[PDB]
Design a protein around this ligand. Structure first.
Ligand SMILES: CCCCCCCCCCCCCCCCCC(=O)OC[C@H](COP(=O)([O-])OCC(O)COP(=O)([O-])OC[C@@H](COC(=O)CCCCCCCCCCCCCCCCC)OC(=O)CCCCCCCCCCCCCCCCC)OC(=O)CCCCCCCCCCCCCCCCC
Ligand SMILES: CCCCCCCCCCCCCCCCCC(=O)OC[C@H](COP(=O)(O)OCCN)OC(=O)CCCCCCCCCCCCCCCCC
Ligand SMILES: CCCCCCCCCCCCCCCCCC(=O)OC[C@H](COP(=O)(O)OCCN)OC(=O)CCCCCCCCCCCCCCCCC
Ligand SMILES: CCCCCCCCCCCCCCCCCC(=O)OC[C@H](COP(=O)(O)OCCN)OC(=O)CCCCCCCCCCCCCCCCC
Ligand SMILES: CCCCCCCCCCCCCCCCCC(=O)OC[C@H](COP(=O)(O)OCCN)OC(=O)CCCCCCCCCCCCCCCCC
Ligand SMILES: CCCCCCCCCCCCCCCCCC(=O)OC[C@H](COP(=O)(O)OCCN)OC(=O)CCCCCCCCCCCCCCCCC
Ligand SMILES: CCCCCCCCCCCCO[C@@H]1O[C@H](CO)[C@@H](O[C@H]2O[C@H](CO)[C@@H](O)[C@H](O)[C@H]2O)[C@H](O)[C@H]1O
Ligand SMILES: CCCCCCCCCCCCO[C@@H]1O[C@H](CO)[C@@H](O[C@H]2O[C@H](CO)[C@@H](O)[C@H](O)[C@H]2O)[C@H](O)[C@H]1O
Ligand SMILES: CCCCCCCCCCCCO[C@@H]1O[C@H](CO)[C@@H](O[C@H]2O[C@H](CO)[C@@H](O)[C@H](O)[C@H]2O)[C@H](O)[C@H]1O
Ligand SMILES: CCCCCCCCCCCCO[C@@H]1O[C@H](CO)[C@@H](O[C@H]2O[C@H](CO)[C@@H](O)[C@H](O)[C@H]2O)[C@H](O)[C@H]1O
Ligand SMILES: Nc1nc2c(ncn2[C@@H]2O[C@H](COP(=O)(O)OP(=O)(O)OP(=O)(O)O)[C@@H](O)[C@H]2O)c(=O)[nH]1
Ligand SMILES: N=C(N)NC(=N)NCCc1ccc(I)c(Cl)c1
Ligand SMILES: [Mg+2]
Lengths: 38, 140, 320, 347, 459, 48, 46, 96
């Protein structure tokens, strides 16, 4: 059957940036609801 | 820029090689200083000396690229006896591209830079001969 | 008018409807602790709306014709299978728990909507505030992985922060040896497979974490199995509470307009229950979800928006 | 926020913009920018969280700085011409200061850094105002001072915005940052043609706003702020994926879609002025935008990403968001090319 | 052209308003009726083209390409409906809509008088084609095939737009009838060298020119059957049609500007023909075969002789039917064994005797057996390039040998030898498949009786 | 009575339906007239 | 007996543009450099 | 030009450079912003007074009113920033 994206393929677009580098290694995806913990 | 660029074009092709090499090295060095200024301002150097080193790396690399291009291009025009020939700048543009490959210690960057700088330099010569405008004055 | 800023501007403000009767009460306890019987008694004695505990098919009961849907439209989450095989490699245990948290979240938004739109109080059986005690027991018993608990806390963190906690938490305390006895008499073949260790973990979470946390912000009333039988004494206690803590005292019309705007929109309510976190137990492949979704649209009254389905008798569709 | 206060604040945002557009006096223009900035800060902060406060502060500092540079240019203009009429400036230092002031307000490169920062930190509806309505007032001023703008400065600003906007979008997974960089590049097209034909500036601006409003409206209907969240759309509202696909192809300038029109017409005006290298370079650089627009179409409409079990619960509820004007906007975002000669109404 | 535009548009409501189980019957039946009426475009005159209106015209170049386009739509419908049988109804209707929208853009593209109108339609074909490949391809790398196909095109097409707008400013019009009378010679200058390249490179990528061809095998390996059919038969010929038109305004600069492309074509046709001898994917072999055949078309167009233009027209039509038939034959095997590997299923003549005959006929036309229009077109080009330079006969002759070698190698490898023992699902050929093959080859061979209608304006 | 909860759009909004159709009929009448005075004014000015 | 290079070039140019600290101090410091360059190098103030 | 314009223009440039070259406190940058307004006020008043353009005599007052109002808003953001982090240091404003 026709291939569709799996979890490994989808996880490419889940990171903080599309192209990881050493500068942005500490970056994390922002909070889901935009609210940083107090 | 206008003053330096006008100096370069005023000197005829294939004559006064040293005067051509000063114009390009001055132009190249200024570009490298511009890059260094933004690099230091946006990506903060760890220490003051590290910032001075980075400015020297970018400024020398840019000046070296500009120096060899002016030297290579003007000698070729002189040796070949072909002043208004775009191929002289194609040779000069590639030589400058190789130095970038040397400074960055990469053969790929040297190969790519040769092609990309060489065509760009040759197009600049056609634009000078043909009167191509990059920032055209509004006419209509 | 469907509720919105215009209806609010024209005088649909919460403080006009709500009175001293306008209270949210939840009843907590272990399994077979009698919370259900007490919950109904408190509701009818105080004239509040009773919500039976939200189970797997709570969402079905509020949409469509209200009847339950086939199991494939809940993911095949099964409480029976959770008892038969807690450590199933199909991920059923946490898929169920993640589903029940979303069901409770939906029920909480419905109960809050009822309170804010009518002023009538509500009685719930457990809630999003107490749902973690089952998560914690499952994890301590090895039924779920630590990555599941991490996923649960992420969803909880960005969902429960939007809501106000219950005015009153009624906890019924029944010891584990007694709970296990009440289970055996009930005679449920699958539920009789429960272990006391699991039950004790449920109790530890209630007393270790839930009740200490609620007391800071709610009116917490505790009763034994025997004291919970006298529903008049329980109802008598509720009517003597002072309601001196909690965030409900900070609420006003403006802040309740925002809350009502949220709880009435069930997709906003459920937005973060589906965060794109690819956990094996809750991730569904594209081919399966596409197939199930197509079948769902084929169920009666599910192809179009409610009121636009000719196969169930909706009329005037060309003028609606 | 009380709904009446929200309405009055929104009307103040619009009023300040309208004051800029109807004013013949530089002071009233400056007041309009001041009024407008005051009223927009509260809609940036309305969710009250550290990221919105940071965005509001960064926005205030950028816009306040540009307002001081604008007033400096106006006062220099007064010194050398003795008048306040909104028109060509009478001093080249006044022209440079106002051009840089207006470039900062628009968020053009190299004054661009705040646009992705601020847009990410505020709600989608506030980001919709920031990237559409907030462009009108500065553009309307550029529309009137262009005869005295330095050509090299304006074309240098335009070229950088197209480059930065294109490269900036390649690395983004956040939809708001994708919109922010997409906006920066589009401003470069708008100002690149301004020295040649301001009508084509207005045409590009109007179409950009239509397409931008469509995307924000569709992101809001689903509460999607990331690429991966948007990849769940196929399993909730399949029609939205098709609409998002068409609008993305249009924002990429692909014929026969509406977004091809502004770039087609701008290329024409530039070439009529014997400008071949610049429009060619801009058109090729715009292929950077097409790449990361296409990437969104792959994860949203042309493939099916994995879903989660709790998604089944969403199937039981309808969309309750207003999505105001979306059916009209999406049709205008995609099907307007056969009516291109209608641009003459902007003359 | 409204008598073709409107009924094509009406195919869309036909498909969406059909009963669920009638979508293929209705769309196929009515698209065949449109194809029948397309033969009214044969009213061509010796001197003047058939000029309908201010927007559309049809000469002897566009008419055969129009007929081929509208003939190909029902064939693609027939070819697609099997592997789309499990698709849900709405997505089937969307698939058919893309094919119809592709026909709409194509027939408008081939009949536009003004070159910017041709450009917009020429570009618009990209959208449904890209959507057909990335949405309805089977494999993971259909996404990459789409990007390569998309960005190869736009890398060349944007300079073309700038040149076209520049030409209108200088000349005052881009109406092709006006250009025939107001055309002026192109003098030597670096500016005209880049005008020439901007006017031509977009069409070179489509053909595709050797060295800009690697997108094509990638696209074919990923496309569904209908995608390959339209791509091989029509979409490549958009570049051929574009070059035949725009060379009008490029003289005399084409004299020396054609050389590097002729060298790429003349050598490229040998390289790609040889590559076919070692291809292991059947679809990739047919894709490389197209590159080799289209190299002849590029040479014909560039040397600009009456004989070469006639050969180019015949080659474009002949290749379209032949290559489309080969993908259909390759796809019929694939729908049984679910692999494109050529060596997987051997000796199929033993198991499928009549499909072996179709393979034989498709191969014979691919190697240009006289008097198929495949040979007529090739022979005319070979005739004309010999006058251009006699040494070209060496490269032309060598290419003929290699083409026969890989064409028959395809036939021997898949149809002859022993059958693969473990492949036990080779069911008898369906009526649909036999009809599909015959609907390619029969009109192709019937054109031998009256070749003049495919020889183009220079006839 | 299929639905457990009465849908918001169970019954057509007759006030809204009347306003909608009244607007369409009003705009068409206003447009048709607008065209007629435009045609007469055009002929009058140009002497047709 | 290159699409990869162009794509690699763009990818590298994208990380230069977007790898930024997010600091108010550094962004406004770059505004000063731009204003200084606009005057000293290109004479946009004339 | 007259002597004064040199120094007033120099004062505006100094505060602009101060504004663009942050240190740590957000309040220091807000002071540079109000310094710029002050120099704009003086330069406007001098130009208007010296030319005897009577109706513009009000312009500098309008400038002061709006800039003060803008300053009140900036102060409000400063305190909201300081409530979150306990300081008004701009290096805390890097979540985005
Ligand atoms: C030439 C260039 C290319 C063409 C350019 C054309 C430009 C577009 C023209 C404008 C199109 C706007 C949409 C037209 C209305 C269609 C929707 C409709 O029928 O609403 C009926 C509306 C109620 O319909 P509904 O069921 O609530 O939702 C309708 C849409 O889904 C509601 O959709 P909505 O949420 O997006 O709201 C639409 C409407 C707000 O909704 C309305 O109330 C309808 C107002 C439409 C005014 C039409 C006047 C057009 C003539 C202009 C002069 O917005 C406005 O206020 C219009 C201003 O009935 C009315 O009240 C009539 C309006 C009375 C005044
Ligand atoms: C990176 C490549 C940038 C181009 C190299 C810099 C250069 O040589 O041009 C500088 C340009 C000179 O132009 P100018 O002498 O001022 O005369 C106006 C011409 N229409 O100076 C300018 O006025 C424009 C500066 C261009 C800045 C980079 C874009
Ligand atoms: C307007 C008139 C002024 C014309 C000049 C405008 C240039 C504005 C550039 C601002 C955006 C640049 C963003 C950027 O590229 O990031 C900063 C960059 C850091 O990159 P860097 O460290 O130098 O490279 C090695 C990394 N391993 O630092 C840089 O090197 C940027 C240099 C850009 C020069 C152009
Ligand atoms: C031509 C372009 C047409 C532009 C139409 C834009 C329609 C507005 C978007 C509809 C989306 C539904 C919606 O709710 O509006 C978004 C927003 C409301 O914000 P929301 O978060 O939903 O709730 C606020 C209460 N605190 O409402 C807003 O904040 C207004 C955002 C749109 C304002 C800018 C519109 C573009 C410029 C218009 C001039 C066109 C020239
Ligand atoms: C006329 C002059 C201008 C010409 C320019 C061209 C304009 C075209 C764009 C118009 C504006 C956008 C509107 C497009 C209409 C899309 C209609 C459609 O695709 O069908 C909707 C369908 C509904 O799905 P569902 O919700 O499930 O209900 C049916 C039960 N399955 O949705 C689905 O089922 C989802 C199926 C998965 C998606 C498949 C992706 C391939 C389909 C692409 C078709 C749209 C192409 C648009 C791109 C531009 C075309 C040139
Ligand atoms: C960047 C490369 C641009 C090449 C330079 C073209 C140019 O600017 O020439 C200027 C000239 C217009 O000058 P004009 O005053 O009108 O007439 C007198 C001629 N000097 O222009 C002309 O006369 C002809 C303009 C034709 C338009 C050229 C389009 C871009 C050419 C570069 C691309 C060509 C290669 C295509 C590669 C595709 C890659 C797949
Ligand atoms: C980023 C920091 C910004 C700091 C801004 C500080 C404000 C500075 C205001 C300076 C205003 C001076 O403006 C400048 O004055 C001189 C005085 O004649 C003008 O005049 C000069 O150039 C013109 C050219 O035609 C002629 O008058 C003459 O050659 C020369 O005197 C300039 O045309 C004008 O550009
Ligand atoms: C006033 C301005 C607007 C003008 C609108 C003019 C057209 C109005 C059409 C109204 C009738 C729509 O008809 C309604 O939709 C479709 C097709 O019609 C029908 O249902 C359809 O199902 C499938 C397709 O999915 C097919 O079998 C077939 O196309 C049809 O039976 C519905 O059973 C019918 O109730
Ligand atoms: C795959 C890509 C293939 C690319 C093929 C490239 C072909 C290259 C063709 C080279 C000829 C270009 O066109 C050439 O331009 C120069 C412009 O200076 C013209 O010459 C003109 O400039 C020179 C200056 O050096 C003057 O001496 C001359 O008097 C003037 O007419 C030539 O008359 C023309 O022959
Ligand atoms: C001349 C006009 C036509 C040109 C059109 C250009 C449009 C821009 C294309 C996107 C550019 C960035 O696109 C990005 O490129 C790099 C390098 O190829 C890819 O990067 C990928 O391949 C490289 C090697 O080739 C690996 O080092 C890398 O780890 C891998 O992720 C990214 O997967 C792709 O997303
Ligand atoms: N795994 C799991 N089971 C749950 C959860 N909530 C309820 N259940 C199960 O639902 C069943 C019935 O709910 P209970 O209230 O605990 O038992 P009950 O006898 O019917 O109700 P009362 O006696 O009145 O208190 C129990 O067997 C529980 O195991 C949960 O969050 N996770
Ligand atoms: N070409 C410019 N840069 N400016 C500009 N629009 N000039 C006016 C030329 C013009 C063009 C179209 C129309 I309709 C009209 Cl009435 C006038
Ligand atoms: Mg119970």
């Amino acid at each position: 059957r026709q291939w569709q994206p799996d979890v490994e393929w989808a996880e490419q677009y889940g990171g903080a940036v599309m192209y990881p580098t050493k500068e942005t290694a500490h970056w994390k995806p922002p909070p889901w609801n935009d609210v940083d913990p107090p | 820029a206008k003053t330096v660029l006008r100096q370069y074009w005023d000197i005829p092709e294939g004559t006064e090689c040293h005067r051509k090499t000063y114009a390009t090295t001055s132009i190249g060095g200024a570009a490298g200083l511009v890059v260094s200024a933004y690099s230091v301002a946006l990506k903060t150097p760890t220490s003051f000396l590290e910032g001075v080193a980075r400015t020297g790396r970018y400024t020398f690399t840019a000046a070296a690229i500009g120096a060899i291009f002016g030297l290579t291009s003007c000698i070729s025009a002189q040796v070949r006896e072909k002043p208004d020939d775009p191929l002289n700048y194609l040779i000069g543009g590639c030589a400058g591209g190789l130095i970038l490959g040397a400074r960055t210690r990469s053969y790929g960057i040297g190969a790519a830079a040769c092609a990309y700088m060489g065509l760009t330099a040759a197009l600049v010569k056609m634009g000078q001969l043909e009167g191509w405008q990059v920032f055209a004055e509004p006419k209509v | 008018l469907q509720y919105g800023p215009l209806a609010y501007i024209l005088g649909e403000k919460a403080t006009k409807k709500m009175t001293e009767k306008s209270k949210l009460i939840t009843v907590d306890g272990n399994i077979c602790s009698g919370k259900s019987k007490l919950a109904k008694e408190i509701a009818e004695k105080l004239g509040l709306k009773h919500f039976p505990e939200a189970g797997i098919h709570y969402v079905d009961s509020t949409t469509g014709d209200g009847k339950p849907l086939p199991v494939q439209f809940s993911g095949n989450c099964s409480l029976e299978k959770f008892y038969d095989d807690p450590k199933s490699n199909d991920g059923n245990s946490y898929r169920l728990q993640a589903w029940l948290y979303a069901s409770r979240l939906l029920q909480y938004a419905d109960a809050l909507e009822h309170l804010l739109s009518t002023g009538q109080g509500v009685v719930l059986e457990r809630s999003i505030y107490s749902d973690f005690v089952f998560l914690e027991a499952m994890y301590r018993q090895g039924f779920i992985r630590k990555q599941c608990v991490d996923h649960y806390n992420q969803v909880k963190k960005v969902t429960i922060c939007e809501y106000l906690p219950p005015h009153v938490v009624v906890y019924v305390d029944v010891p584990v040896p007694e709970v296990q006895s009440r289970i055996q008499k009930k005679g449920n073949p699958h539920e009789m497979k429960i272990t006391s260790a699991y039950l004790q973990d449920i109790e530890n979470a209630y007393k270790g974490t839930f009740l200490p946390e609620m007391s800071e912000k709610c009116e917490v009333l505790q009763y034994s199995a025997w004291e919970a039988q006298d529903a008049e004494k329980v109802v008598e206690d509720i009517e003597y509470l002072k309601y001196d803590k909690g965030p409900w005292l900070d609420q006003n019309d403006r802040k309740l307009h925002k809350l009502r705007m949220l709880v009435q929109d069930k997709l906003e309510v459920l937005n973060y229950t589906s965060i794109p976190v690819f956990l094996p137990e809750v991730t569904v492949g594209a081919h399966q979800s596409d197939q199930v979704f197509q079948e769902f649209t084929e169920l009666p009254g599910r192809k179009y928006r409610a009121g636009y389905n000719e196969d169930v008798g909706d009329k005037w569709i060309w003028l609606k | 926020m009380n709904p009446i206060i929200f309405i009055i604040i929104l009307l103040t945002i619009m009023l300040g913009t309208i004051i800029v557009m109807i004013s013949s006096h530089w002071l009233l223009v400056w007041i309009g920018f001041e009024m407008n900035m005051l009223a927009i800060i509260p809609i940036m902060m309305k969710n009250h969280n550290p990221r919105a406060t940071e965005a509001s502060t960064k926005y205030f500092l950028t816009q306040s700085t540009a307002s001081m540079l604008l007033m400096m240019a106006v006062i220099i203009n007064l010194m050398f011409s003795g008048q306040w009429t909104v028109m060509k400036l009478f001093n080249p230092m006044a022209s440079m200061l106002m051009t840089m002031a207006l470039a900062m307000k628009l968020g053009m490169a190299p004054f661009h850094f705040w646009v992705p920062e601020v847009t990410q930190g505020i709600p989608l509806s506030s980001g919709l105002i920031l990237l559409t309505w907030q462009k009108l007032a500065p553009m309307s001023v550029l529309y009137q001072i262009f005869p005295s703008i330095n050509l090299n400065l304006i074309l240098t600003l335009s070229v950088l915005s197209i480059l930065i906007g294109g490269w900036g979008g390649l690395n983004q997974t956040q939809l708001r940052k994708i919109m922010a960089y997409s906006s920066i590049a589009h401003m470069g097209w708008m100002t690149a043609v301004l020295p040649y034909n301001p009508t084509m500036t207005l045409l590009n601006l109007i179409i950009y706003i239509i397409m931008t409003s469509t995307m924000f409206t569709m992101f809001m209907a689903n509460s999607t702020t990331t690429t991966l969240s948007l990849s769940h759309t196929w399993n909730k509202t399949p029609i939205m994926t098709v609409l998002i696909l068409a609008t993305l192809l249009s924002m990429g300038g692909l014929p026969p879609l509406s977004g091809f029109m502004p770039k087609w017409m701008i290329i024409q005006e530039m070439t009529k002025n014997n400008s071949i290298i610049l429009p060619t370079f801009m058109a090729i650089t715009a292929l950077l935008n097409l790449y990361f627009y296409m990437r969104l179409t792959y994860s949203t409409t042309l493939t099916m990403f994995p879903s989660t079990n709790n998604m089944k619960m969403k199937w039981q509820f309808p969309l309750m968001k207003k999505m105001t004007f979306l059916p009209t906007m999406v049709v205008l975002s995609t099907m307007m090319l056969p009516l291109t000669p209608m641009l003459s109404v902007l003359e | 052209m409204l008598k073709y535009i409107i009924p094509t548009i009406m195919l869309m409501p036909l498909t969406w308003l059909s009963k669920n189980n009638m979508i293929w019957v209705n769309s196929t039946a009515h698209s065949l009726l449109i194809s029948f009426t397309s033969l009214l475009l044969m009213n061509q005159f010796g001197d003047n083209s058939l000029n309908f209106s201010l927007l559309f015209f049809s000469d002897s170049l566009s008419t055969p390409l129009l007929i081929l386009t509208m003939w190909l739509l029902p064939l693609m419908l027939m070819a697609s409906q099997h592997h789309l049988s499990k698709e849900n109804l709405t997505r089937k209707k969307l698939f058919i809509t893309m094919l119809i929208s592709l026909q709409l853009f194509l027939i408008m593209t081939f009949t536009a008088m003004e070159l910017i109108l041709f450009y917009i339609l020429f570009e618009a074909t990209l959208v449904p084609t890209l959507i057909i490949i990335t949405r309805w391809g089977n494999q993971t790398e259909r996404l990459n095939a789409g990007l390569y196909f998309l960005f190869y095109t736009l890398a060349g097409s944007l300079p073309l737009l700038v040149a076209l707008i520049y030409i209108q400013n200088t000349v005052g019009s881009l109406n092709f009838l006006m250009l025939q009378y107001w055309v002026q010679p192109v003098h030597n200058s670096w500016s005209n060298v880049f005008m020439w390249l901007a006017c031509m490179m977009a069409f070179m990528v489509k053909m595709p020119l050797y060295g800009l061809h690697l997108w094509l095998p990638k696209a074919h390996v990923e496309a569904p059957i209908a995608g390959s059919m339209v791509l091989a038969a029509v979409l490549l010929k958009l570049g051929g049609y574009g070059m035949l038109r725009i060379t009008l305004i490029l003289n005399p600069m084409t004299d020396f500007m054609a050389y590097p492309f002729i060298m790429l074509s003349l050598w490229g046709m040998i390289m790609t023909s040889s590559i076919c001898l070692r291809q292991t994917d059947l679809k990739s072999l047919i894709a490389y075969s197209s590159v080799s055949h289209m190299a002849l078309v590029i040479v014909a167009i560039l040397i600009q002789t009456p004989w070469s233009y006639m050969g180019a027209t015949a080659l474009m039509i002949a290749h379209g039917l032949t290559s489309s038939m080969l993908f259909c034959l390759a796809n019929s095997n694939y729908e049984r064994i679910h692999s494109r590997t050529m060596i997987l299923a051997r000796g199929l003549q033993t198991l499928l005797p009549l499909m072996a005959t179709w393979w034989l006929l498709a191969s014979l036309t691919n190697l240009a057996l006289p008097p198929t229009i495949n040979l007529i077109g090739e022979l005319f080009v070979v005739m004309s390039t010999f006058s251009w330079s006699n040494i070209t006969i060496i490269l032309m002759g060598v290419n003929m040998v290699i083409t026969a070698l890989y064409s028959l190698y395809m036939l021997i490898m898949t149809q002859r030898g022993k059958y693969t023992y473990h492949i036990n699902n080779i069911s008898p050929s369906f009526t649909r498949e036999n009809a599909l093959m015959s609907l390619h080859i029969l009109p192709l061979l019937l054109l031998t009786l009256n070749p003049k209608i495919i020889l183009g304006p220079l006839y | 009575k299929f639905y457990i909860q009465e849908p918001p759009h169970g019954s057509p909004n007759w006030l809204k339906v009347g306003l909608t159709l009244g607007t369409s009929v009003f705009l068409w009448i206003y447009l048709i007239k607008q065209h007629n005075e435009d045609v007469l004014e055009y002929k009058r000015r140009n002497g047709l | 007996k290159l699409p990869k290079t162009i794509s690699l070039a763009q990818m590298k140019a994208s990380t230069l543009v977007t790898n930024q600290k997010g600091l108010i101090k550094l962004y406004f410091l770059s505004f000063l450099i731009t204003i200084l360059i606009s005057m000293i190098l290109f004479n946009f103030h004339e | 030009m007259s002597m004064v314009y040199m120094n007033i223009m120099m004062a505006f440039t100094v505060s602009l450079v101060g504004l663009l070259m942050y240190r740590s406190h957000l309040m220091s940058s807000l002071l540079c912003l109000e310094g710029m307004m002050l120099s704009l006020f003086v330069m406007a008043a001098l130009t208007i007074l010296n030319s005897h353009f009577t109706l513009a005599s009000m312009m500098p007052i309008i400038l002061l009113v709006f800039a003060a109002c803008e300053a009140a808003l900036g102060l409000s953001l400063l305190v909201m920033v300081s409530n979150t982090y306990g300081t008004d240091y701009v290096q805390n404003l890097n979540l985005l």
